[PDB]
Structure 1
Amino acid sequence: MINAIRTPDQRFSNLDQYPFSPNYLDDLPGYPGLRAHYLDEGNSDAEDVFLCLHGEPTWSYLYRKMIPVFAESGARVIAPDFFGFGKSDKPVDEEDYTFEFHRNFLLALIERLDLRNITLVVQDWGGFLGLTLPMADPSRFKRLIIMNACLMTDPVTQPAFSAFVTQPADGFTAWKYDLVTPSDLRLDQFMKRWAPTLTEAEASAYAAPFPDTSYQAGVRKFPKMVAQRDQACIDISTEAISFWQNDWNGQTFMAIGMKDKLLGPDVMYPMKALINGCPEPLEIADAGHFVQEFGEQVAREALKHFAETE
């Protein structure tokens, strides 16, 4: 019904530091015939669930350094790949991908797996989407680990969440240009540019899911949605602000990648004030946008912060 394609299994043969077994679902209500991949690590019967959401133009591979730390603590860790990324199916038309398409997949996943006691771990798109989830079923959410992310609200309600789109020129402007313009988009080269500490191997794992451009429609659409926010996105992200500010009673841990030209400190400080009870952020000086690349440390420090309240 939704025309999609699937990456050949052989593209993931040679992955570096990703020994996690695949789990798939192809029976989600609203996504017929589409197969979603997700990792499910640690004790399946654990009380605590770490729901790890990735963003553009990545996949669960991004949390590979945090997963073992959260698992080792006794938690179950869920790390789904959005349709159009990783090992999940990829709709071939850019028009199929919208903010609700991705947000409703997550609410479906969460219901399907019956996830409870959720510690939400987000960044980038994982956070644009993920921060609008708790208000849909607040009983399932208990903690939040937030890295460089904000809400896709309208320019007037929160100028900080809109200003980065236009400036600086080597910020989101550069990001979007690198992603939606080339007719020969090489993810490994893009990642090496935006996360300069990746090895060749790690960079290659980020291109793994896309053999050619026909597999990249979701990758092309995400940056356009940051630039052109539809009405549902705006209304939903605007209502989320109220949730975080007045309804949220959980534990929060915030980590900022200080070299991020996109969602760095001028975006993170304002998010921190809207999140009720958000403590002082852990600023990682050498980290850029992809804070997970410096994940072991964020994982360790947040568990340490959350233990100190149990």
Structure 2
Amino acid sequence: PGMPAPGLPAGFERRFSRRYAQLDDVRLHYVTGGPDDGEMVVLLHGWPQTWYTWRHVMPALAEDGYRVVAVDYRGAGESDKPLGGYDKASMAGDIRALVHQLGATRIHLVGRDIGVMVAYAYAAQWPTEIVKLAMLDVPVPGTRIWDEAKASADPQIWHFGLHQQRDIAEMLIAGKERAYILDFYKKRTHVALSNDDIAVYADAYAAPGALRAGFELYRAFPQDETRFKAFMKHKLPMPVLALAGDKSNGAKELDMARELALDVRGAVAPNTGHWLPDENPAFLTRQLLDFFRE
């Protein structure tokens, strides 16, 4: 029993900090906590999200001694909104430059949606640098699960077309970010979420340039498909964990991951929709802690 409880979990404000990393062109925002010497765990959100999606996962990771780094990737949240560089492979390079600036090289990596595309491109480009990789909720371009949704005209990716209309998508949705993003979020959730938590994301995407930069991730999709099919000719060597909720992609996340990697295990969260960190963080953290210590 219990009504949705919005906001950061108790004690969060004391153990995490907001920080910036200046890369060559772009400044990235991220939130970090946990032991300065711990194994680094990087968490990458998707669309329409920010670092905030991980709020209920980050304390448990830090309390198990991980150095937690939750990044607003290029164009999202409080990060800069540059003109280009929104293909996932180049965005993986942004994350890597941030990791190196923090003194790390080998990391654990967790991604969902656009972030799982970024994460995969990070592992394909620098396989020796990713100790373990966890893949949540969405398939990556290049996979058959991806191609099947496209050829089916799957209802839950209806928005790819709209988002790929340069200037038209921005003109339609500017000023209506909250109504658009709340509707998007609730149609894919199964666990009841708080409007206040979803509004944290929506307000981020109403900031100047946030809509455009979010949509350019979609507009780079055909480039990602080409780049990713090339990546897929070399299966990933490191252990991979695939998770998704049963009301959304479910077992297809693990099907998808097996086309990508040699060493794969997976699970399906019960009574959970599209937003694993929002909807079922308890299941997510237990799976990650067992995976990372294994």
**What TM-score results when the alignment is normalised by the length of structure 2?**
0.81
Answer yes or no: is the 8 Å Cα contact 2:134–2:240 preserved in 1.
yes
Answer yes or no: is the 8 Å Cα contact 2:144–2:256 preserved in 1.
no
Runs of at least 5 residues in structure 2 that lack an aligned partner in the other structure: 1-5
Deviation at 1:275, TM superposition (A): 1.9
Answer yes or no: is the 8 Å Cα contact 2:58–2:68 preserved in 1.
yes
Answer yes or no: is the 8 Å Cα contact 1:179–1:219 preserved in 2.
no
1:254 to 242, 261, 265: 242
Instruction: Supply the distance in 2 between the matched residues of 1:175 and 1:194 (Cα, whole angstroms).
Output: 15
1:288 to 238, 257, 273: 273
Instruction: Supply the distance in 1 between the matched residues of 2:78 and 2:71 (Cα, whole angstroms).
Output: 9
Q: Report the equivalent of 1:192.
A: 186
Answer yes or no: is the 8 Å Cα contact 2:177–2:206 preserved in 1.
no
> 1:49-88 deviations in whole A, cap 9, x for unaligned?
1110111111111111111111110010111101221111
Please state if 1:106 is matched with 2:106: no
**What TM-score results when the alignment is normalised by the length of structure 1?**
0.77
1:59 to 38, 50, 53: 50
Answer yes or no: is the 8 Å Cα contact 1:188–1:205 preserved in 2.
no
Q: Report the equivalent of 2:18.
A: 22
Q: Report the equivalent of 2:104.
A: 115
Please state if 1:150 is matched with 2:139: yes
Answer yes or no: is the 8 Å Cα contact 2:232–2:260 preserved in 1.
yes
Please state if 1:278 is matched with 2:268: no
Deviation at 1:131, TM superposition (A): 0.6
| Residues 269, 275 of structure 1: alpha-carbon distance in 2 compared, 3 angstrom cutoff | same
What SS does the corresponding residue of 1:190 show, helix, strand or coil?
A: helix
Q: Which moved more, 1:296-305 or 1:198-207?
A: 296-305
1:49 to 21, 25, 40: 40
1:139 to 128, 132, 138: 128
What SS does the corresponding residue of 1:90 show, helix, strand or coil?
A: coil
Answer yes or no: is the 8 Å Cα contact 2:81–2:209 preserved in 1.
no
Q: Which moved more, 1:122-131 or 1:176-185?
A: 176-185
Deviation at 1:102, TM superposition (A): 2.0
| Residues 168, 52 of structure 1: alpha-carbon distance in 2 compared, 3 angstrom cutoff | same
What SS does the corresponding residue of 1:22 show, helix, strand or coil?
A: strand
Deviation at 1:202, TM superposition (A): 0.7
Runs of at least 5 residues in structure 1 that lack an aligned partner in the other structure: 1-14
1:70 to 56, 61, 68: 61
Answer yes or no: is the 8 Å Cα contact 1:147–1:291 preserved in 2.
yes
User: Equivalent pairs: percent with the same residue?
Assistant: 20
Deviation at 1:119, TM superposition (A): 1.2
Q: Report the equivalent of 1:303.
A: 289
Answer yes or no: is the 8 Å Cα contact 2:243–2:253 preserved in 1.
no
Q: Report the equivalent of 2:3.
A: none
What SS does the corresponding residue of 1:209 show, helix, strand or coil?
A: helix
What one-letter code is carried by the residue in structure 1 that aligns with 2:45?
H
Answer yes or no: is the 8 Å Cα contact 2:189–2:274 preserved in 1.
yes
Q: Report the equivalent of 2:152.
A: 167
1:126 to 115, 119, 136: 115
Please state if 1:80 is matched with 2:65: no
Q: Report the equivalent of 2:251.
A: 265
Count of residue pairs brought into register by the alignment: 273
| Residues 194, 160 of structure 1: alpha-carbon distance in 2 compared, 3 angstrom cutoff | closer
What one-letter code is carried by the residue in structure 1 that aligns with 2:19?
N
| Residues 225, 289 of structure 1: alpha-carbon distance in 2 compared, 3 angstrom cutoff | farther
| Residues 137, 297 of structure 1: alpha-carbon distance in 2 compared, 3 angstrom cutoff | same
What SS does the corresponding residue of 1:85 show, helix, strand or coil?
A: coil
Instruction: Supply the distance in 1 between the matched residues of 2:159 and 2:151 (Cα, whole angstroms).
Output: 10
What SS does the corresponding residue of 1:299 show, helix, strand or coil?
A: helix
Instruction: Supply the distance in 2 between the matched residues of 1:256 and 1:21 (Cα, whole angstroms).
Output: 29
